[PDB]
Tab-separated table of N, CA, C and O and ligand atoms in Angstrom:
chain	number	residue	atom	x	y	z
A	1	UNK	N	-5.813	-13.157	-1.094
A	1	UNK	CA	-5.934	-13.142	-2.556
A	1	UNK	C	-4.629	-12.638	-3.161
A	1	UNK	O	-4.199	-11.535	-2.826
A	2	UNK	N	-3.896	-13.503	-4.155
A	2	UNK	CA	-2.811	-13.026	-4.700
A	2	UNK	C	-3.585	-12.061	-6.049
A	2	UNK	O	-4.259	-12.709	-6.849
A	3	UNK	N	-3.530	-11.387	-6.140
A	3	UNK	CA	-3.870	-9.970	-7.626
A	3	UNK	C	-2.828	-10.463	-8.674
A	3	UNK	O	-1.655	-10.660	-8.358
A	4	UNK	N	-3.308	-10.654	-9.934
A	4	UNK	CA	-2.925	-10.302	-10.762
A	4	UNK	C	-2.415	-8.747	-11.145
A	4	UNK	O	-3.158	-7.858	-10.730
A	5	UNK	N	-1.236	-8.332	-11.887
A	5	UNK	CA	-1.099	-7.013	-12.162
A	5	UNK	C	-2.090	-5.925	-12.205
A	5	UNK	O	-2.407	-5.071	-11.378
A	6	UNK	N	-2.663	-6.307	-13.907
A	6	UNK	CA	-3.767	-5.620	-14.235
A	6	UNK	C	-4.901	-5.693	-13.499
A	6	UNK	O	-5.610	-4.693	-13.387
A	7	UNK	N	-5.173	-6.679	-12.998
A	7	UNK	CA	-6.301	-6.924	-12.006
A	7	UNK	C	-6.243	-5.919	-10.723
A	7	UNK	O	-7.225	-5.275	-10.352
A	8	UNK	N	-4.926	-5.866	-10.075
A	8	UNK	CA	-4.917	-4.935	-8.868
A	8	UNK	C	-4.763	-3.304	-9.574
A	8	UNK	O	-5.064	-2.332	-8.881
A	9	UNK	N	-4.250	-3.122	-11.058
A	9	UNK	CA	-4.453	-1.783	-11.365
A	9	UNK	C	-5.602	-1.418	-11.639
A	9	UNK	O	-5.838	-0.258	-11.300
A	10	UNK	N	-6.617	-2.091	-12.242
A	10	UNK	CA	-7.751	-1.694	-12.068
A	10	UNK	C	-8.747	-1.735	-10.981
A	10	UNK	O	-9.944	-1.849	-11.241
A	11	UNK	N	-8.415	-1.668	-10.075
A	11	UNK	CA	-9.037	-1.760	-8.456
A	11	UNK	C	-8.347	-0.949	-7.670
A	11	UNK	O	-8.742	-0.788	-6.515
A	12	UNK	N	-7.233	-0.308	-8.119
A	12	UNK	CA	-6.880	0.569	-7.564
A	12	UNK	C	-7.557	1.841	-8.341
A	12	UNK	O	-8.115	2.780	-7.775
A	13	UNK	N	-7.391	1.678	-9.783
A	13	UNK	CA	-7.779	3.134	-10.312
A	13	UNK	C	-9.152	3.384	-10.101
A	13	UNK	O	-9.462	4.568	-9.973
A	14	UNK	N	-10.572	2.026	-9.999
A	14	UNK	CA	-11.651	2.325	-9.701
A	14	UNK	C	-12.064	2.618	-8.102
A	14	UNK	O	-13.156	2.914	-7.617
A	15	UNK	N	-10.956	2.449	-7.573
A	15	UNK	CA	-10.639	2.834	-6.178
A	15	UNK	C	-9.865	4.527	-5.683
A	15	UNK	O	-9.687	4.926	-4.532
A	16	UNK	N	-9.534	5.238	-6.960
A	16	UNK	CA	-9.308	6.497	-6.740
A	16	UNK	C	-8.036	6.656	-6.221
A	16	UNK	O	-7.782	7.497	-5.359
A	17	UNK	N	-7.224	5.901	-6.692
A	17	UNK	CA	-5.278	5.799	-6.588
A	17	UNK	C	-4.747	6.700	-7.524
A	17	UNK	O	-4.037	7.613	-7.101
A	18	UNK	N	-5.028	6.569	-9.021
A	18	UNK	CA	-4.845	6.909	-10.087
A	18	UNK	C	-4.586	8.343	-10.041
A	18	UNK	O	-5.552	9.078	-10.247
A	19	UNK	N	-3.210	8.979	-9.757
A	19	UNK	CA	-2.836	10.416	-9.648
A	19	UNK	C	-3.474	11.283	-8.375
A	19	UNK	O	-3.640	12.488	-8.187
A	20	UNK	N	-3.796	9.882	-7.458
A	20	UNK	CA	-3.771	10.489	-5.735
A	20	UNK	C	-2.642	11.316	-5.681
A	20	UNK	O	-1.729	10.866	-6.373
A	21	UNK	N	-2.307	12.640	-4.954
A	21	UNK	CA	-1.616	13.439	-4.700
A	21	UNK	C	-0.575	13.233	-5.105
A	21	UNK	O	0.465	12.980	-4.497
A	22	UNK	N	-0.921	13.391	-6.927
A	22	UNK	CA	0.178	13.379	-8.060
A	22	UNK	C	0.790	11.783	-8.417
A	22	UNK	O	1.619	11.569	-9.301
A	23	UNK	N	0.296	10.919	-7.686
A	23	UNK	CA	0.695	9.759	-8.123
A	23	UNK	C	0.382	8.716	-8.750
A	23	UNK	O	-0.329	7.776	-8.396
A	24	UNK	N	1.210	8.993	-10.180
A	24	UNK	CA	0.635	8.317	-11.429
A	24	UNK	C	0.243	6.488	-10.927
A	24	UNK	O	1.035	5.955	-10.149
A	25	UNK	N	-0.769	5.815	-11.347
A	25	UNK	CA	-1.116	4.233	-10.868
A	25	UNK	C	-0.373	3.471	-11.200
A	25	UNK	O	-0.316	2.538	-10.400
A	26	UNK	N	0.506	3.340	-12.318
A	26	UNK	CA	2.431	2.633	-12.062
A	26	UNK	C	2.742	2.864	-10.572
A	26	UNK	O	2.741	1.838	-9.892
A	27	UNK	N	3.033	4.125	-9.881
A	27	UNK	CA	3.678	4.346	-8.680
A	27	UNK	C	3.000	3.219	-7.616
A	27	UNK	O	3.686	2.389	-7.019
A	28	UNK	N	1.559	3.331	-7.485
A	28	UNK	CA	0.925	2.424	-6.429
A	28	UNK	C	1.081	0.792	-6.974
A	28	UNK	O	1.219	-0.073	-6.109
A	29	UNK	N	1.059	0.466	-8.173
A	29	UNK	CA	1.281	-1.177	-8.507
A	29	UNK	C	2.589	-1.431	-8.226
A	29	UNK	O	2.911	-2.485	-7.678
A	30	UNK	N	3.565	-0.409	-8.600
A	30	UNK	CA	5.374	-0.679	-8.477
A	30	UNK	C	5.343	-0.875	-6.668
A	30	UNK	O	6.082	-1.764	-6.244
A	31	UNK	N	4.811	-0.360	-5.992
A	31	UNK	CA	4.797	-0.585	-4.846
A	31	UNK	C	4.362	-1.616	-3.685
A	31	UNK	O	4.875	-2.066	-2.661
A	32	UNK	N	2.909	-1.780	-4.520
A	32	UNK	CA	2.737	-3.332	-4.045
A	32	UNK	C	3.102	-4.231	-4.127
A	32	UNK	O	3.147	-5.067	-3.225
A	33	UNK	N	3.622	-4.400	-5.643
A	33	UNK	CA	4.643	-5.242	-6.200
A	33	UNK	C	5.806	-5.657	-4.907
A	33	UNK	O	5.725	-6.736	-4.319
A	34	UNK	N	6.957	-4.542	-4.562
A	34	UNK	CA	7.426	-4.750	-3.808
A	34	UNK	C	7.205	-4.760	-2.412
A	34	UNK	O	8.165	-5.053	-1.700
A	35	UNK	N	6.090	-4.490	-1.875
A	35	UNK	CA	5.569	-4.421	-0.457
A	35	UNK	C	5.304	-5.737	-0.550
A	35	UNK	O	6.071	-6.396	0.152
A	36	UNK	N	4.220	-6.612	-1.367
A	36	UNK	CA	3.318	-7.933	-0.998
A	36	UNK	C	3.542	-9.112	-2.131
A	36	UNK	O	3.171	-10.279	-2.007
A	37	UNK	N	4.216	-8.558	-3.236
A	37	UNK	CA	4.090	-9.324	-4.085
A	37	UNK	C	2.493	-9.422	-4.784
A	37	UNK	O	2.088	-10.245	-5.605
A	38	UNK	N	1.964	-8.601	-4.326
A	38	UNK	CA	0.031	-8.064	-5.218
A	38	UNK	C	-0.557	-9.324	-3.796
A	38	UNK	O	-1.573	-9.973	-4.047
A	39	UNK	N	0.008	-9.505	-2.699
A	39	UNK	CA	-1.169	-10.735	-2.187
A	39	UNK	C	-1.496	-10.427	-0.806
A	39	UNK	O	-0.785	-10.664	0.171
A	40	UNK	N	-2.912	-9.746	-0.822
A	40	UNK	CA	-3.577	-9.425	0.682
A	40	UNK	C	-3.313	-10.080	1.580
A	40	UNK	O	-3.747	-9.548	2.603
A	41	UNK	N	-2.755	-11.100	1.797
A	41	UNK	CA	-2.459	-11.859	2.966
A	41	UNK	C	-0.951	-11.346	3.470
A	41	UNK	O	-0.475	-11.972	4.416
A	42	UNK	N	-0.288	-10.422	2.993
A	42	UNK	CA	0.848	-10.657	3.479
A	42	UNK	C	0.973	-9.600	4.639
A	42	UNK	O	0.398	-8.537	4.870
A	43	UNK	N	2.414	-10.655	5.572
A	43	UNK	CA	2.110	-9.926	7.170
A	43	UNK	C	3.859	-9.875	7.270
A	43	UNK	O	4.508	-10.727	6.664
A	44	UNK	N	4.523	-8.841	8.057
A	44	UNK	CA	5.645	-9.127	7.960
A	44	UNK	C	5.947	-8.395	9.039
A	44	UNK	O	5.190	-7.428	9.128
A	45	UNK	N	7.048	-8.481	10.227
A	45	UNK	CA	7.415	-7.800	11.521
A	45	UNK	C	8.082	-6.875	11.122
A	45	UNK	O	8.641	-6.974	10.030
A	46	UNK	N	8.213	-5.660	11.940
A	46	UNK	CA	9.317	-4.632	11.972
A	46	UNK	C	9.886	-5.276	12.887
A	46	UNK	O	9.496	-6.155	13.656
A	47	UNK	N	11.737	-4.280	12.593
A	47	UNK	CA	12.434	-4.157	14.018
A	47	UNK	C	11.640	-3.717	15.184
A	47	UNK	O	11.793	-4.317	16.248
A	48	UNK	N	10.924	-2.871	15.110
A	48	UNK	CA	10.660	-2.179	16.191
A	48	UNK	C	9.462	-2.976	16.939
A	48	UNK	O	8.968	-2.469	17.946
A	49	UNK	N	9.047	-4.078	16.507
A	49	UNK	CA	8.013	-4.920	17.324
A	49	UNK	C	6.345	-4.349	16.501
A	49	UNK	O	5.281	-4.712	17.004
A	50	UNK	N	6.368	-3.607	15.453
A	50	UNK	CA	5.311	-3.378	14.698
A	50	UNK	C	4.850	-4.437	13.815
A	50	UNK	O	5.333	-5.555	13.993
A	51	UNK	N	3.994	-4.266	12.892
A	51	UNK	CA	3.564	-4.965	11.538
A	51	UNK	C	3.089	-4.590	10.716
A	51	UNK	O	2.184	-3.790	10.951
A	52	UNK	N	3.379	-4.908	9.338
A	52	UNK	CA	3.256	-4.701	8.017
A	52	UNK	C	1.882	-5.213	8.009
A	52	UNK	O	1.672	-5.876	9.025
A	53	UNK	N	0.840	-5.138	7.197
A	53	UNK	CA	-0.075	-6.021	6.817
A	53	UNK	C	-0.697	-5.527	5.090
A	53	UNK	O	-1.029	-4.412	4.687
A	54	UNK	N	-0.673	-6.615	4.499
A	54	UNK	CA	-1.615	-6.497	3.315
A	54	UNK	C	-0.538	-5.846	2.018
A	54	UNK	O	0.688	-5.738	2.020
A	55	UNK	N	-1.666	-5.443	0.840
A	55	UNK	CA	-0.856	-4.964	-0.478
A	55	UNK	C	-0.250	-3.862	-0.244
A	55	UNK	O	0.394	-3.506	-1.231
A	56	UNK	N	-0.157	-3.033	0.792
A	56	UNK	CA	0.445	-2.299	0.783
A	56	UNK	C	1.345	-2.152	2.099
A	56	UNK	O	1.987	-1.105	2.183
A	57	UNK	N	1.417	-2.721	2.732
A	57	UNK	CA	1.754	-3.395	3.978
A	57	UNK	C	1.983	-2.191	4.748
A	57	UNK	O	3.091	-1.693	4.947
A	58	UNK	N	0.821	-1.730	5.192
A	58	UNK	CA	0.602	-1.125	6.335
A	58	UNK	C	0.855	-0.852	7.500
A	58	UNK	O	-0.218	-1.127	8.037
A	59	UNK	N	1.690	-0.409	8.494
A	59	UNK	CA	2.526	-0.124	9.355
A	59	UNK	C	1.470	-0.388	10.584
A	59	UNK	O	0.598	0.437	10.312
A	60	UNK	N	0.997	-1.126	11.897
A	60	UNK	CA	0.544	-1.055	13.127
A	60	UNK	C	1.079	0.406	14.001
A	60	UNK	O	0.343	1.166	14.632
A	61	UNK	N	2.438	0.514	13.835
A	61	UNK	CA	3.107	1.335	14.442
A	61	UNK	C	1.865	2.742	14.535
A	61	UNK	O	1.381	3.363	15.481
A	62	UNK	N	1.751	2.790	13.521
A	62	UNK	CA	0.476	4.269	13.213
A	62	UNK	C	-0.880	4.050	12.556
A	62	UNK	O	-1.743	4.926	12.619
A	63	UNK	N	-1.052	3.066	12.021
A	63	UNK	CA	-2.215	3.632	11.111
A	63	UNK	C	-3.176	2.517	11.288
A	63	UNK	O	-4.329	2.865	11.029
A	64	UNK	N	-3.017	1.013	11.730
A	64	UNK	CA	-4.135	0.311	11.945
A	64	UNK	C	-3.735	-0.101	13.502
A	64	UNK	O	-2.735	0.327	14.079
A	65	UNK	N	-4.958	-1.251	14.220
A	65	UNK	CA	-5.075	-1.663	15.247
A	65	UNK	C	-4.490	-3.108	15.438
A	65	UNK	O	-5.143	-3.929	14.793
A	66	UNK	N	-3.738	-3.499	15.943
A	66	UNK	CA	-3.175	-5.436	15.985
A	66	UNK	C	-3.468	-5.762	17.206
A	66	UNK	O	-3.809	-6.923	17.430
A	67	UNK	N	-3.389	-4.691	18.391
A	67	UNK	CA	-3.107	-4.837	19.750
A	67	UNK	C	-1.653	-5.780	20.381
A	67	UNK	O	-1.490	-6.489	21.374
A	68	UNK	N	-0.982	-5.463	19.520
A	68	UNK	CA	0.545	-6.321	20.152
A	68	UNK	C	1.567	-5.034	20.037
A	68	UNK	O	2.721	-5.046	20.464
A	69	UNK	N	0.873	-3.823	19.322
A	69	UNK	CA	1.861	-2.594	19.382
A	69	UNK	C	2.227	-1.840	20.045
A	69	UNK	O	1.850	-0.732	19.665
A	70	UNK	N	2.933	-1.799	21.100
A	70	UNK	CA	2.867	-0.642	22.566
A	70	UNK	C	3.225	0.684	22.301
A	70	UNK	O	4.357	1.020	21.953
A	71	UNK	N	2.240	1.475	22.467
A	71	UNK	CA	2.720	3.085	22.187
A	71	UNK	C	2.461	3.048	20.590
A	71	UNK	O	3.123	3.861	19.944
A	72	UNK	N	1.397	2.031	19.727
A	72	UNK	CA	1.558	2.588	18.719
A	72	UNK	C	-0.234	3.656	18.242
A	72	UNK	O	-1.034	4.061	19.086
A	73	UNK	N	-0.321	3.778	17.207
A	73	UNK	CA	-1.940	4.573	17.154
A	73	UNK	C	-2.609	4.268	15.940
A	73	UNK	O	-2.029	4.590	14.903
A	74	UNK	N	-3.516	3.809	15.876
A	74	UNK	CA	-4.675	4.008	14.516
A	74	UNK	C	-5.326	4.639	14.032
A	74	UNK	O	-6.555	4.616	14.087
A	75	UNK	N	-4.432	5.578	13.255
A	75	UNK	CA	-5.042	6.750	12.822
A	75	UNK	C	-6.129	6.294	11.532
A	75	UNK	O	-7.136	7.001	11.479
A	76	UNK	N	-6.059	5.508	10.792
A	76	UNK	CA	-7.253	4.479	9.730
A	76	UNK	C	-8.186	3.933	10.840
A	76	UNK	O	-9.107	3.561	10.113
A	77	UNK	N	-8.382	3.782	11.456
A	77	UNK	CA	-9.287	3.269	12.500
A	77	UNK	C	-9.914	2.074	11.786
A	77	UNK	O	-11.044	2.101	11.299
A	78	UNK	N	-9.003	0.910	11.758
A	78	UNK	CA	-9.103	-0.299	11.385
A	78	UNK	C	-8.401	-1.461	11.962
A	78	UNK	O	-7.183	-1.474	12.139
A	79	UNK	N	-9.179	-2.419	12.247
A	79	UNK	CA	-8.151	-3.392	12.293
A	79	UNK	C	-7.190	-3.949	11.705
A	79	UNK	O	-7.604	-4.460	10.665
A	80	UNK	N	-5.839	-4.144	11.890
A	80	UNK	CA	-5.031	-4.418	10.695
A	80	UNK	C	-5.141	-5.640	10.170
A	80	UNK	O	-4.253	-6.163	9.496
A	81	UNK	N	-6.654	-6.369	10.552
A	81	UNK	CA	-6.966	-7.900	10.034
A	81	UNK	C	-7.533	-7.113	8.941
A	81	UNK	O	-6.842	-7.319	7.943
A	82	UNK	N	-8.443	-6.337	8.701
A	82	UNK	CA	-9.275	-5.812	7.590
A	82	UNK	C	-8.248	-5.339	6.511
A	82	UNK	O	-8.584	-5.686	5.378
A	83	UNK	N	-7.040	-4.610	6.582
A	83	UNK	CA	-5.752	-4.586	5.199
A	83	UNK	C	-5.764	-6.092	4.694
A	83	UNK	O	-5.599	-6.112	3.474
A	84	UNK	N	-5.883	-7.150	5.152
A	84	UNK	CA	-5.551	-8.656	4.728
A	84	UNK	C	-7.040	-9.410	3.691
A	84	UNK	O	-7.142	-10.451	3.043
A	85	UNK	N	-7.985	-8.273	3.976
A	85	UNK	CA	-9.429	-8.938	2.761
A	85	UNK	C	-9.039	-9.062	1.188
A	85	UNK	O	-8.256	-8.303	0.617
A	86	UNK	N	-9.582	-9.926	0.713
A	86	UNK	CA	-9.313	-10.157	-0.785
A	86	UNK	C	-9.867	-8.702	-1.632
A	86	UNK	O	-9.583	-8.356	-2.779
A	87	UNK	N	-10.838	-7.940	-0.522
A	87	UNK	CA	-11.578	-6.237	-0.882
A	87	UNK	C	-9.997	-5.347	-0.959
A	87	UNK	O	-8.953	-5.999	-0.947
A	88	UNK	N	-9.986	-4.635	-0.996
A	88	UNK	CA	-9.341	-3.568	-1.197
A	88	UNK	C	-9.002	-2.338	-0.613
A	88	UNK	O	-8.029	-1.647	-0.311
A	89	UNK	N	-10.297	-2.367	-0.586
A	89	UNK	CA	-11.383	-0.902	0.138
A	89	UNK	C	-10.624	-0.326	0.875
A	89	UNK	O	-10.206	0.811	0.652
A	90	UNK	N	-10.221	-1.269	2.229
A	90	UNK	CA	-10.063	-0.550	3.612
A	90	UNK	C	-7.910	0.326	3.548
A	90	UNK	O	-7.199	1.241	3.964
A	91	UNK	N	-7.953	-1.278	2.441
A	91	UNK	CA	-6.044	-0.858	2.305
A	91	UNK	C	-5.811	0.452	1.790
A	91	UNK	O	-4.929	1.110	2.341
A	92	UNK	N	-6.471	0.976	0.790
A	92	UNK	CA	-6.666	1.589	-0.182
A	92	UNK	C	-7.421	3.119	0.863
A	92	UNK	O	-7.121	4.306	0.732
A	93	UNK	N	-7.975	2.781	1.398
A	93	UNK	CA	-8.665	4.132	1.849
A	93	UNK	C	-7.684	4.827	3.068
A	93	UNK	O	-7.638	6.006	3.418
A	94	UNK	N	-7.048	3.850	3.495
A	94	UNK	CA	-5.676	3.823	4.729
A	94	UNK	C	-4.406	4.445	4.214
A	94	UNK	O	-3.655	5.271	4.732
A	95	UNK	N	-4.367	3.749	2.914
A	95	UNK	CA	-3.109	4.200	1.874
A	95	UNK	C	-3.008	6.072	1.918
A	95	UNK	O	-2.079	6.838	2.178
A	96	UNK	N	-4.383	6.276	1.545
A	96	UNK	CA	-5.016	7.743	0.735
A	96	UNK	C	-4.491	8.520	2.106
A	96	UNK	O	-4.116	9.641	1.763
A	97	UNK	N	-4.415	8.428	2.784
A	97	UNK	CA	-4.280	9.576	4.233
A	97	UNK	C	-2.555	8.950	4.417
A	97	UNK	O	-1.945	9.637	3.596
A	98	UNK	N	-1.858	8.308	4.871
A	98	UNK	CA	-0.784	7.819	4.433
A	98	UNK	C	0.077	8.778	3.525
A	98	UNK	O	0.844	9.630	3.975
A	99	UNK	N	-0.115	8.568	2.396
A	99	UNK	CA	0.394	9.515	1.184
A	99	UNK	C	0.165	10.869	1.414
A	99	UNK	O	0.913	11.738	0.967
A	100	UNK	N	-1.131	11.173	2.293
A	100	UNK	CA	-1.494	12.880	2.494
A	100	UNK	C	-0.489	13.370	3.862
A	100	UNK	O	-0.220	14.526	4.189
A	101	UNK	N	-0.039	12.068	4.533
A	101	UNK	CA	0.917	12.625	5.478
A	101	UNK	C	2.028	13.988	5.614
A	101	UNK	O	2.226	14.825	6.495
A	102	UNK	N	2.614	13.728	4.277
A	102	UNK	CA	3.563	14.838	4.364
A	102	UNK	C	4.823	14.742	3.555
A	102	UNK	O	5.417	15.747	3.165
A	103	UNK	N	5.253	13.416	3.289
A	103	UNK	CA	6.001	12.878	2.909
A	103	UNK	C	5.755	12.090	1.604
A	103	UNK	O	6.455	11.082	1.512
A	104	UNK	N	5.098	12.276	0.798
A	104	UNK	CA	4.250	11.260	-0.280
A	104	UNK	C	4.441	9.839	0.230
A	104	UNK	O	4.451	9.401	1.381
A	105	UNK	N	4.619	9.123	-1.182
A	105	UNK	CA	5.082	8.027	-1.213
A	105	UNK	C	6.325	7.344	-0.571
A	105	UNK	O	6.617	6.157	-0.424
A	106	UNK	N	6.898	8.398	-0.269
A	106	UNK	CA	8.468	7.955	0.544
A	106	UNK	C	8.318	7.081	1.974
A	106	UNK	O	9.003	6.216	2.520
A	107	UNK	N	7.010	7.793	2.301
A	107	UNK	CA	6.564	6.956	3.482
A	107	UNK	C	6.247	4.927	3.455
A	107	UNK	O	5.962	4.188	4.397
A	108	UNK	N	6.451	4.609	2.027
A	108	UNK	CA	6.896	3.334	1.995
A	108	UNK	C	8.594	3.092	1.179
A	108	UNK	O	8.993	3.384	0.051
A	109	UNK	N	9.215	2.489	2.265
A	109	UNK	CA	10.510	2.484	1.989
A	109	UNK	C	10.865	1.572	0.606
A	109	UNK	O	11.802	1.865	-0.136
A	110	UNK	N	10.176	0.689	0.433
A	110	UNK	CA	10.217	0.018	-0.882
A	110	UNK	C	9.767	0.907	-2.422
A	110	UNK	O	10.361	0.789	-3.494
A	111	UNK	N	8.729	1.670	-2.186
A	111	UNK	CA	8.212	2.570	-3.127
A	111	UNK	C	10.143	3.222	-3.535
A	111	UNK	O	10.916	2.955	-4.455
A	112	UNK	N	10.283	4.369	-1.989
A	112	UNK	CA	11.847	5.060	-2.397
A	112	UNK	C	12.822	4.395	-3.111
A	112	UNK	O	13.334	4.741	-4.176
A	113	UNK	N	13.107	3.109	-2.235
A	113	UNK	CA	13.816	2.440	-2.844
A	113	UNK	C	14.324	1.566	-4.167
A	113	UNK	O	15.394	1.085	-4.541
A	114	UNK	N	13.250	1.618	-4.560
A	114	UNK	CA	12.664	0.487	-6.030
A	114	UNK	C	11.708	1.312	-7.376
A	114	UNK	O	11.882	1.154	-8.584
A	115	UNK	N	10.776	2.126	-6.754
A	115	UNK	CA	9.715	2.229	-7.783
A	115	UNK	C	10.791	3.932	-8.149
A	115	UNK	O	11.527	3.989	-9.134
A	116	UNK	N	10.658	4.997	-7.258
A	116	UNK	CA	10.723	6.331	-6.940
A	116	UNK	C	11.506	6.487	-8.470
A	116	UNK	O	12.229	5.520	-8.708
A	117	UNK	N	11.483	7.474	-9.475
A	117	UNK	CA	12.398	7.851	-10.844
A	117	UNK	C	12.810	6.928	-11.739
A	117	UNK	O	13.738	7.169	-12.510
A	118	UNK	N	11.887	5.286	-11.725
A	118	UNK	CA	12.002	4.801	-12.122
A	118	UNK	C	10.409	4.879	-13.382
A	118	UNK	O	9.372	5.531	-13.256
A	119	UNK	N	10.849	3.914	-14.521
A	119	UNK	CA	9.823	3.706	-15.677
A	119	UNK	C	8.428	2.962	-14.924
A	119	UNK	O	8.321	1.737	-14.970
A	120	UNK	N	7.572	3.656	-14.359
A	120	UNK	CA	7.174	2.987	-13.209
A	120	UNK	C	5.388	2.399	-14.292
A	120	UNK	O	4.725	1.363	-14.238
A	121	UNK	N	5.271	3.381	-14.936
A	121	UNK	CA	4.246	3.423	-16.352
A	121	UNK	C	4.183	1.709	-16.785
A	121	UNK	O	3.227	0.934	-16.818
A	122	UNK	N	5.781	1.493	-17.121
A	122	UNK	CA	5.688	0.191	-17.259
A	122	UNK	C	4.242	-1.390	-16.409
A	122	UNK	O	3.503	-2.266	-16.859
A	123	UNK	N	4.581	-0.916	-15.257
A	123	UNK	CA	3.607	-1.349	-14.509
A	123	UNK	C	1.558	-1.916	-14.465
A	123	UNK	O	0.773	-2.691	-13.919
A	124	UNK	N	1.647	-0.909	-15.402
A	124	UNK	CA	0.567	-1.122	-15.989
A	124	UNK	C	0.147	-1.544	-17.452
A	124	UNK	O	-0.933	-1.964	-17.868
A	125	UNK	N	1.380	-1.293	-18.121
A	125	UNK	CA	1.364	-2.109	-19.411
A	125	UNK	C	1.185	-3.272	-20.231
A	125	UNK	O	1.966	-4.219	-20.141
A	126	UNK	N	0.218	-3.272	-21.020
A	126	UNK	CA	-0.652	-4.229	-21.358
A	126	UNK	C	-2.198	-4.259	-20.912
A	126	UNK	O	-2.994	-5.038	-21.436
A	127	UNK	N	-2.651	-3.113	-19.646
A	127	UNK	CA	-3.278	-3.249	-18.949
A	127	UNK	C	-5.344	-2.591	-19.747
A	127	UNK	O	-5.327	-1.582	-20.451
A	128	UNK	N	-6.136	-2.983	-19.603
A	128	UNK	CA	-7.356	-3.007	-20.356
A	128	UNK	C	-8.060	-1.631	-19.290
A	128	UNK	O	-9.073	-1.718	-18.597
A	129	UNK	N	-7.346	-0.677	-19.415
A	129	UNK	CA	-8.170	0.840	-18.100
A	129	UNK	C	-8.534	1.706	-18.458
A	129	UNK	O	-8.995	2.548	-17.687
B	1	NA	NA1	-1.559	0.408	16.100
């Protein structure tokens, strides 16, 4: 499912994103934005022989299951086919422990790179929440 903007901000905020450990719901749309382009299907390789999966493109390396990852762990205890549902749920509940890691949001390099001290508010503008 490709998301519309407002469509994925309000599924995130009725999903409990909305100032997750301080992070305003601009921060999580600016991010998907650049992780997936808003579209659950997306899958993309690391260097390191890992995978991205979904709107928030989720790392195999640690947090879901692919079985092509050697030495990696699933701490979401999910398959990383379930980040790729047109639902939300599972990306979103994977995300929430992710962000509680230690590191906020930095832990997606696109977030640092793109969203991080930027007008990120913008993101949701226009939006009916
Ligand atoms: Na894994």
């Amino acid at each position: 499912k490709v998301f519309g903007r407002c469509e994925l901000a309000a599924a995130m905020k009725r999903h409990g994103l909305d100032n997750y450990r301080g992070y305003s719901l601009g921060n999580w749309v600016c991010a998907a934005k650049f992780e997936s382009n808003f579209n659950t299907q997306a899958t993309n390789r690391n260097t390191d022989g890992s995978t991205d999966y979904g709107i928030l493109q989720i790392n195999s390396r640690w947090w879901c299951n692919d079985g092509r990852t050697p030495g990696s762990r699933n701490l979401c205890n999910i398959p990383c086919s379930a980040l790729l549902s047109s639902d939300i749920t599972a990306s979103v509940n994977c995300a929430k422990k992710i962000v509680s890691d230690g590191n906020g949001m930095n832990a997606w390099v696109a977030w640092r790179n793109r969203c991080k001290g930027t007008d990120v508010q913008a993101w949701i503008r226009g939006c009916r929440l």
